[PDB]
Curated annotation (Swiss-Prot), chain A:
Illness association: CODAS syndrome: A rare syndrome characterized by the combination of cerebral, ocular, dental, auricular, and skeletal features. These include developmental delay, craniofacial anomalies, cataracts, ptosis, median nasal groove, delayed tooth eruption, hearing loss, short stature, delayed epiphyseal ossification, metaphyseal hip dysplasia, and vertebral coronal clefts.
Top-level taxon of the source organism: Eukaryota
Source taxonomy: Eukaryota, Metazoa, Chordata, Craniata, Vertebrata
Protein purpose: ATP-dependent serine protease that mediates the selective degradation of misfolded, unassembled or oxidatively damaged polypeptides as well as certain short-lived regulatory proteins in the mitochondrial matrix. Endogenous substrates include mitochondrial steroidogenic acute regulatory (StAR) protein, DELE1, helicase Twinkle (TWNK) and the large ribosomal subunit protein MRPL32/bL32m. MRPL32/bL32m is protected from degradation by LONP1 when it is bound to a nucleic acid (RNA), but TWNK is not. May also have a chaperone function in the assembly of inner membrane protein complexes.
Family, per entry: Belongs to the peptidase S16 family.
Protein name: Lon protease homolog, mitochondrial
Domain remark from Swiss-Prot or TrEMBL: The Lon N-terminal domains are crucial for the overall structure of the protein, maintaining it in a conformation allowing its proper functioning.
Expressing tissues: Duodenum, heart, lung and liver, but not thymus.
Subcellular location(s) per record: Mitochondrion matrix
Gene: LONP1
Subunit structure: Homohexamer. Organized in a ring with a central cavity. The ATP-binding and proteolytic domains (AP-domain) form a hexameric chamber, while the N-terminal domain is arranged as a trimer of dimers. DNA and RNA binding is stimulated by substrate and inhibited by ATP binding. Interacts with TWNK and mitochondrial DNA polymerase subunit POLG.
Length: 48, 49
């Protein structure tokens, strides 16, 4: 149970906003506010 | 401990609060100025506690 647990396995992220633009508009019509907030979230993580 | 006067919160937030959150978001002071006036407007209006 202990060894199985990742300790540093780091799934690589995408961080370009463009690909996030596309994939968000692919799967949910409207509800633009949550899209805008999450988009800002990626935008901030990409900096720091 | 007591509460805080309306004006007093400005002198708190100008020092011990904005810089802390500024460090939470990972910014540096060079890019994220907040004049005193925006803060007095905030506390005067958007939060009465």
């Amino acid at each position: 149970w202990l060894t199985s647990i990742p300790w540093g396995k780091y799934s690589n992220e995408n961080l370009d906003l463009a690909r996030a633009q596309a994939v968000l508009e692919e799967d949910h019509y409207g509800m633009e506010d949550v899209k805008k907030r999450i988009l800002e979230f990626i935008a901030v993580s990409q900096l720091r | 401990v007591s509460g805080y006067v309306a004006q007093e919160k400005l002198a708190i937030a100008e020092r011990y609060l904005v810089p802390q959150a500024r460090a939470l978001c990972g910014l540096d002071e060079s890019k994220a100025k907040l004049s005193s006036d925006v803060l007095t407007l905030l506390i005067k209006q958007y939060c009465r506690e």
